[PDB]
Write a protein that binds this ligand. Structure first.
Ligand SMILES: Nc1ncnc2c1c(C#CCNC(=O)COCCO)cn2[C@H]1C[C@H](O)[C@@H](COP(=O)(O)OP(=O)(O)OP(=O)(O)O)O1
Ligand SMILES: [Mg+2]
Ligand SMILES: [Mg+2]
Ligand SMILES: [Mn+2]
Length: 539
DNA sequence: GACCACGGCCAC
DNA sequence: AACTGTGGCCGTGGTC
């Protein structure tokens, strides 16, 4: 292109180079812009940001986050990645997109600006006529990128000293467990090495091997295997407690305090918008979509996520979301009725599983029902179900027969979805988000049946993900007008931060927005809670 | 140091 | 184990 001087005319496509992938931690090494056959390279990239009215180009949200970090309101606009991601959600990285639609992703801001321009022209062209995908782009993904940029730049407060103290406590408990494991093994070894543990359990000790690993065919030491060996030897019980504690310590307790941002004093994740095959978001660096909650220790970790002084956290979580979506997508009269009568299937399966009435179901029991209810729905085998619930085989088969007869039109929808996917090569959500599944006609059974379970899962999970994204787009402006903040999204959950005096009003309004985002044949119920910490806010 | 595959495991 | 699905991060063991 013809190199022209900075600044660029309005509407130009930006290219930028970061010192590291995390925009909140990155140094802006270079900045450029392309438009009208010209390329504009900025002398000083930081001051050159102030000249742009919009981040338009590849990975636009990342540059918008860095601008917010510097106190600049530079919103993200068009991004070829979002167009490619809607065309085919396997388009997840700029390296692939560039190769597939006419360019090369280099490490130079100018070339990245020119690439953004060329890729947008070609991808925008491939989308004309795909009115449903364009609707998703204009009404969901492009507006959503702006919401996510603000979430990423805002961050969440964390009780550092609390986790620091917790680490020392867990460390002492880990030493007690590993000391008994070594004694029981007769000698010490690296208990973190599953290869070394394999020998101790199955070679030195006489324990039987329950299963093999996928890629290398070693004797597995997974929780499901150790759980099956729980009575075969006392050492097994302690290895499971050792695994729980080292998992939480090495993944959450120790790394998270070291990630507080020096300017903000808060913890900043990244919400990746083109990372999943179903339309869900993902979270990384750090992932805040898998903070513990199951075990008592996991709850102590979740308590570390707190509200700023004078504020409160507001947590909103859709009820039985993918089951409600299934009712709407399938049209099953019976399942619709279940939610019109305010029934809760997780609680019901839980009572069934545990031989305990609804009133006596605790939060932990209900969680176990989710694996069952969603396991069965998405193709779980009778054999495994029997093994998970520790009950005979015929009983497990009976649960699955009862499950689907209760809602006959589900299997009809599954079959229509698969037949539709074989003819067109893709399945779609309620809004037209597509996932290509070419293995539906594979002539290897395992490969084909795997494709089938991914295929008919995507419309359900992806529709729920669509609803949440749309709700986030509608809610964000209402929160700014109330002086509240959107902090985290966990698939079907939102965590907000609100001034104490407006916390209750924010909770009400956020609940209404999420429930009336897009009415279905069943009502969307949202559970909401308020508290000083994340755990308190979901009760 | 930077990768990588793998087994394993946290969440939805 | 996996013959529910969607993710990302850990330590180990290995290569460069
Ligand atoms: N196992 C799954 N397989 C496939 N899909 C799944 C799950 C799963 C789970 C789980 C917990 N168990 C484990 O992680 C394993 O450990 C077992 C050891 O015992 C969630 N989803 C999907 C569908 C769901 O509607 C959506 C949001 O989730 P989530 O707000 O919590 O539920 P929900 O909205 O329905 O229900 P509530 O809000 O509580 O009303 O995510
Ligand atoms: Mg949830
Ligand atoms: Mg892996
Ligand atoms: Mn939910």
């Amino acid at each position: 292109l013809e190199e022209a001087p900075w600044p660029p005319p309005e509407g130009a496509f930006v290219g930028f180079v970061l010192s590291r992938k995390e925009p909140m931690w990155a140094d802006l090494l270079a900045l450029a812009a392309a438009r009208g056959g010209r390329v504009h390279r900025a002398p000083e990239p930081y001051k050159a940001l102030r000249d742009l009215k919009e981040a338009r180009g590849l990975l636009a949200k990342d540059l918008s986050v860095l601008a917010l970090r510097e106190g600049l309101g530079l919103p993200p606009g068009d991004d070829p990645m979002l167009l490619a991601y809607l065309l085919d959600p396997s388009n997840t990285t700029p390296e692939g997109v560039a190769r597939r639609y006419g360019g090369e992703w280099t490490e130079e801001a100018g070339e990245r600006a020119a690439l953004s321009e060329r890729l947008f022209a070609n991808l925008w062209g491939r989308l004309e006529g795909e009115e449903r995908l364009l609707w998703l782009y204009r009404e969901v993904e492009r507006p959503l990128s702006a919401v996510l940029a603000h979430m990423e730049a805002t961050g969440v407060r964390l009780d550092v000293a609390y986790l620091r103290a917790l680490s020392l406590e867990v460390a002492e408990e880990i030493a007690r467990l590993e000391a008994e494991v070594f004694r029981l093994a007769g000698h010490p070894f690296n208990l973190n090495s599953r290869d070394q543990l394999e020998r101790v359990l199955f070679d030195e000790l006489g324990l039987p091997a329950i299963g093999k690993t996928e890629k290398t065919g070693k004797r597995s030491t997974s929780a499901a295997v150790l759980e099956a060996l729980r009575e075969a030897h006392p050492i097994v019980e302690k290895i499971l407690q050792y695994r729980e504690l080292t998992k939480l310590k090495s993944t959450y307790i120790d790394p998270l305090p070291d990630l507080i941002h020096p300017r903000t004093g808060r913890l900043h994740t990244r919400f990746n918008q083109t990372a999943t095959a179903t339309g869900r978001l993902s979270s990384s660096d750090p992932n805040l979509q898998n903070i513990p909650v199951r075990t008592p220790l996991g709850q102590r970790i979740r308590r570390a996520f707190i509200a700023e002084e004078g504020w409160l956290l507001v947590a909103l979580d859709y009820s039985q979301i993918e089951l409600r979506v299934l009712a709407h997508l399938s049209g099953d009269e019976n399942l619709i009725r279940v939610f019109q009568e305010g029934r809760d299937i997780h609680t019901e399966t839980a009572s069934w599983m545990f031989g305990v009435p609804r009133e006596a179901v605790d939060p932990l029991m209900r969680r176990a029902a989710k694996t069952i209810n969603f396991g069965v729905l998405y193709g779980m085998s009778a054999h495994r179900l029997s093994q998970e619930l520790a009950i005979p085989y015929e009983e497990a088969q009976a649960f699955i027969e009862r499950y689907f007869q209760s809602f006959p039109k589900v299997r009809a929808w599954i079959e229509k979805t698969l037949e539709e996917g074989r003819r067109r090569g893709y399945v779609e959500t309620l809004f037209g988000r597509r996932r290509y599944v070419p293995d539906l006609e594979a002539r290897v059974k395992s490969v084909r049946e795997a494709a089938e379970r991914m295929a008919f899962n995507m419309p359900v999970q992806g529709t729920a993900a669509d609803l949440m994204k749309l709700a986030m787009v509608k809610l964000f402006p209402r929160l700014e007008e109330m002086g509240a903040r959107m902090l985290l999204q966990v698939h079907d959950e939102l965590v907000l931060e609100a001034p104490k005096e407006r916390a209750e009003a924010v909770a009400r309004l956020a609940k209404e927005v999420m429930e009336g985002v897009y009415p279905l044949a069943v009502p969307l119920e949202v559970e909401v809670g308020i508290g000083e910490d994340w755990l308190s806010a979901k009760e």
